[PDB]
């Protein structure tokens, strides 16, 4: 095994979240930049990466990886500017959701103290916190307000990683030169990657950080099932947008959520739901025949795609509830954004059980963007044989460990074949 300075690594999906972090941590660890090759279907930040977004939520997860990430969002100079500490307003209505939120709030008063969390026990208490809401839309609502967390400028953070890597001299391959087709195996040892255009890249170690595409590219035995979530955007005038400067993330699990406007006055609005699959026949490397698996329907490949009609209705209901004064604004740049769920919702970060020096770094399960600053550190540890055993176990190769179609969500994902309104191919 060579020294870090002499080790060649290929990061497949290095234009995405986990992949770009991996490349960053290899460089920060003293790998020689020109020995690191980032391969992606699309140039960093990849136009189909789940992290290519105006915003993501940063919550207050006590988990060690989430904690370490939070410290870097606060303190690391590459990342800090992209974390917006607006807090979060979690709204609840109906007996069931209110009971759940009260229990959750009590757990904070119990477990690791409250401190930065408030209970809002009426409409008027919510309005004092967020005067931009409309009373007649929030009848019977209560809320938890958390001063911790807020939102992350996701595409900008990945873009900042790519500029850093570029300036260090990392090597890149994109499009046909970056789209993984197969590992290169020599008697059960991975020694590189071949791309769609026929280019062959050789390295000591290969990381597959291909997000929702990972189970399409190599045989993962249904350990990961790929699903889409949805959003769209509305455009506020400068005067309208000023009202929502530093506004908290607003969330109601029965409705959806929205963010503070970006610097161009655009609000992104999301639904809350268990995700959509898109099953079709496909043959990943390592599969003996085509199989029915959920294959992302990429908005980058298909920019005329929007989102299902059902989704538009839900997002319109969210705007009508949270921002009734903006109900006549067009919802634009509608898109589907893909992730991959494991059965238990933990990551899949492990060496392949048959292909030595080929490593999986996926299973993001819809809540990994917030790990961008830290996650590559754990991937480097895996490559070097130093990942903490409890994490190695939690993130292990585990086919047959449960049904990832439902995962730890409320319901099995429905399928885009059954959800009209997104496809505008003709
Ligand atoms: C979709 C989504 C996700 C999301 C979210 C809202 C939506 C609508 N809200 C979040 C939130 O509030 N907080 C949070 O922490 N996470 C949230 N998420 C999830 C998050 O976006 C994902 O968990 C995370 O971004 C996933 O990272 P991962 O690195 O696994 O995936 P990726 O960024 O999509 O990157 C994968 C890359 O692989 C490349 N690719 C695909 N095929 C190939 C081939 N053949 N060859 C080479 N590269 C390939 C992609 O192009 C991509 O760059």
Protein described:
The PDB classes it as oxidoreductase. With 426 residues, the protein is of the alpha/beta class. It is 24% helix and 26% strand. Strands 6-7-5-15-16-17-14-21 form an eight-stranded mixed β-sheet. The chain is globular. It binds flavin-adenine dinucleotide.
Order of adjacent strands in the largest pleated sheet: 6-7-5-15-16-17-14-21
Care to count the β-strands? 24
User: What is the C-level CATH assignment?
Assistant: Alpha Beta
The number of helical elements comes to: 10
CATH superfamily membership: FAD/NAD(P)-binding domain
Radius of gyration, taken over Cα atoms and rounded to an integer in Å: 22 Å
Percent of residues in β-strands: 25-35%
**Ligand names:** flavin-adenine dinucleotide
Tally of separate domains: 1
Helix proportion range = 10-25%
PDB class: oxidoreductase
Keywords: FAD, Deglycating enzyme, Amadori product, Fructosyl Peptide Oxidase, Oxidoreductase
Assembly: monomeric
Entry title: Engineered Fructosyl Peptide Oxidase - X04 mutant
């Amino acid at each position: 095994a060579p020294s870090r300075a002499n080790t060649k690594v290929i990061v497949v999906g290095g234009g995405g979240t986990i992949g770009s972090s991996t490349a960053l941590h290899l460089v920060r660890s003293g790998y020689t930049p020109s020995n690191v090759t980032v391969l992606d279907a699309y140039p960093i930040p990849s136009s189909q990466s789940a992290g290519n977004d105006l915003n993501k939520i940063m919550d207050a997860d006590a988990d060690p990886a989430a904690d370490a990430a939070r410290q870097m969002w606060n303190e690391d100079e590459l990342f800090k500017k992209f974390f917006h500490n607006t807090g979060r307003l979690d709204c609840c209505h109906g007996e069931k959701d209110i009971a759940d939120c009260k229990k959750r709030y009590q757990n904070l008063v119990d477990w690791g103290l409250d401190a930065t969390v408030e209970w809002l026990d009426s409409e008027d208490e919510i309005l004092k916190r967020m005067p931009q809401l409309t009373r007649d839309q929030i009848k019977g609502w209560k809320a938890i307000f958390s001063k911790d967390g807020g939102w992350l400028a996701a595409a900008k953070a990945i873009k900042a990683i790519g500029e850093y890597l570029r300036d260090q001299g990392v090597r890149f391959g994109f499009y046909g030169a970056g789209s993984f087709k197969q590992p290169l195996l020599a008697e059960g040892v991975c020694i590189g990657v071949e791309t769609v255009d026929g280019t062959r890249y050789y390295a000591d170690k290969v990381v597959l950080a291909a997000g929702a595409w990972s189970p399409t590219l190599v045989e993962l035995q249904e350990q990961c099932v790929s699903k889409a979530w949805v959003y769209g955007h509305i455009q506020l005038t400068p005067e309208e947008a000023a009202r929502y400067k530093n506004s908290p993330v607003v969330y109601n699990g029965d409705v959806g959520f929205f963010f503070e406007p970006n610097e161009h006055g655009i609000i992104k609005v999301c639904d809350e739901f268990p995700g959509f699959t898109r099953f079709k026949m496909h043959q990943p490397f390592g599969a003996k025949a085509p199989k029915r698996i959920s294959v992302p329907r990429s908005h980058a490949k298909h920019p005329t795609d929007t989102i299902p009609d059902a989704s538009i209705v839900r997002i319109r209901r969210a705007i009508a509830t949270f921002m009734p004064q903006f109900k006549n604004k067009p919802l634009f740049n509608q898109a589907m954004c893909w992730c991959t769920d494991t059965a238990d919702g933990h990551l899949l970060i492990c060496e392949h059980p048959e292909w030595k020096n080929f490593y999986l770094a996926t299973g993001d399960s819809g809540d990994s963007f917030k790990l961008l600053p830290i996650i590559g550190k754990y991937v480097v540890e895996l490559l070097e044989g130093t990942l903490a055993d409890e994490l190695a176990h939690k993130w292990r190769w585990r086919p047959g460990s449960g049904d990832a179609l439902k995962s730890r969500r409320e319901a099995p994902a429905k399928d885009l074949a059954d959800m009209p309104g997104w496809n505008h191919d003709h």
